[PDB]
Amino acid sequence: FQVEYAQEAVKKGSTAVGVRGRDIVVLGVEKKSVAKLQDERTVRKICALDDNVCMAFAGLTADARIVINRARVECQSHRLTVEDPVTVEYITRYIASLKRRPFGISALIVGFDFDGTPRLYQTDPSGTYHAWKANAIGRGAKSVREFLEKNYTDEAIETDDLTIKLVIKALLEVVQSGGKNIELAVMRRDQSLKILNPEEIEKYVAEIEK
């Protein structure tokens, strides 16, 4: 009843695609147009939760900014009591239990869990969460997930060829010619979260067009 009103903004929010690899895990979202006179810095939808975990979202950008700044405390209040970083399942179970009414967002929480294991989760707005090899959340999520079901097996030989012929090729299934309409994120095992600048985002699309 009240959770159904949360999902209607997930189906209209911008797409969010994540696959999981042997060594790296990749998020990628559809950077929408803003306006002619809107500075497009404050509208980025890939947020880092701690040094080994980050998430995308799709839904209300107001209720997302509540979810992110509550999960960023539980990533740090974990380290006070445990001294170990969060497992990706801990902060996913925290976000899902955080979601009166649930906060109307669906997220793709990715990262590594102190043993180097790659992880990819999804908090649907019902309060449910489960594991994923590759997943899609957003406006064209049903067709992108059908695309990722077709391509998973022999792609993880090279971490570059895994994560463009899947991830950018899954955004290109729904999103435009690219370069200025893809916000792509990639994190290695225990290195950092790096958002690829569009000088390098257009580099990988040219290999896909070939």
């Binding site: 803003v34 306006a35 002619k36 006179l37 809107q38 500075d39 497009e40 810095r41 404050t42 509208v43 950008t61 107001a62 209720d63 900014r65 509540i66 700044n69």
Partner: protein, 207 residues
């Protein structure tokens, strides 16, 4: 829709341009802070609402701007002051925010009443906003804009949105926020300087 405040970002300053609206003649023309409410030493704001709910929203921003300064001994960055009120409005008036910080330079924001903000190069809120949002999108060099070129754009798009025959030179409240000698200066421009921009527009647009 009550106010007509509008922000314009330039390479060397931001400017708010609000119009002083006086309904009845027997309302006292207040000599206090009228339309552009200064938040701390490097940030100002303007609301699209009545001057009683203005004093609630600005004196809550000033608690956030000084609980920060008490805690870090640095002035608040001009997005975290926007964000902290947008978290309070998430749990009913639209605002603009001009300011400067060392991270992202001159900034301009626009808080929705729902609790959403965004960085704008120029925008409007209040009475006849979309009439003047569309007029800014016509003529705004998004990057090639000097301060006086932004300042001439303000009294241009205010001469096509408010009043009759004088652009209300004693009822328009342009404030500019510039950098000068390391500190940060907020100049609510005086009535002699606000009248000459009407004079420099009525001469340049007639000729």
């Amino acid at each position: 829709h009550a106010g007509t405040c509008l922000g314009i970002l330039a390479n060397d300053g931001v400017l708010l341009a609000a119009e002083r609206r006086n309904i009845h003649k027997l309302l006292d023309e207040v000599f206090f802070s009228e339309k552009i409410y200064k938040l701390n030493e490097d940030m100002a704001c303007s609301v699209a609402g009545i001057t009683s709910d203005a004093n609630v929203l600005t004196n809550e921003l000033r608690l956030i701007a000084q609980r920060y300064l008490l805690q870090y001994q640095e002035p608040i960055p001009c997005e975290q002051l926007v964000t902290a009120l947008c978290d309070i409005k998430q749990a009913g008036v639209s605002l603009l925010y001009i300011g400067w910080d060392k991270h992202y330079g001159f900034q301009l924001y626009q808080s929705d009443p729902s609790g959403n903000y965004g960085g704008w190069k120029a925008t409007c809120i209040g009475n006849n906003s979309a009439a003047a949002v569309s007029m800014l999108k016509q003529d705004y060099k998004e990057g090639e804009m000097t301060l006086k070129s932004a300042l001439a754009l303000a009294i241009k798009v205010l001469n096509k949105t408010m009043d009759v025959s004088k652009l209300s030179a004693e009822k328009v409240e342009i404030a500019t926020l510039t950098r000068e000698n390391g500190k940060t200066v907020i100049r609510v421009l005086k009535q002699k300087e606000v009248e000459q921009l009407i004079k420099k527009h009525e001469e340049e647009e007639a000729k």
